[PDB]
Amino acid sequence: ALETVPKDLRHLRACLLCSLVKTIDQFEYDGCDNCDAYLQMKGNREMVYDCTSSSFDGIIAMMSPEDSWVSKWQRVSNFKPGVYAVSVTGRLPQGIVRELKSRGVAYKSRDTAIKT
């Protein structure tokens, strides 16, 4: 499944919930490979902007979510193989966070970067 990796380096965004890094076109077309069932990001550019942030630190190629220490460090050991940023800065809208909590999905920030 090449649908979980970028085709070019322009307009790349990172999913604020699972740190998946895809082109905004990929997010618009096929949605998030790990959050579309809870977000329904397919075919909605505005919702893609809301849930994915263009600004992130680092790139990590992930192949063995069940056999990677970096998967444990990044808490991405239950996600699909793809291009995963090291730190994704941002926060979801409050309504989406409450919707996830009502569904039962706890929202943990991916911004693991040390501030000051």
Partner 1 sequence: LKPKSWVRLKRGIYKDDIAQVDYVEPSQNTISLKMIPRIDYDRIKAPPQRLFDAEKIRSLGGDVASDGDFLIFEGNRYSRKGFLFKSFAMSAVITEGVKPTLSELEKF
How many angstroms from the chain centroid is the CA of residue 99? 17
CB of 3 to partner 1, least distance (A): 26
Q: What are φ and ψ of residue 91, in 5° steps?
A: -150, 145
The answer to whether 32 contacts Zn ion (rule: CB under 5 A) is: yes
- The window from 27-35, 40-48, 91-99, 106-114 that contacts Zn ion (CB under 5 A) reads 27-35
Strand, coil or helix: what is 112?
Answer: coil
Measure the CA–CA gap between 18 and 6, rounded to whole angstroms: 16
54 binds, among Zn ion, partner 1, none (CB under 5 to 8 A by kind): partner 1
Among 18, 39, 76, 85, binds Zn ion (CB under 5 A): 18
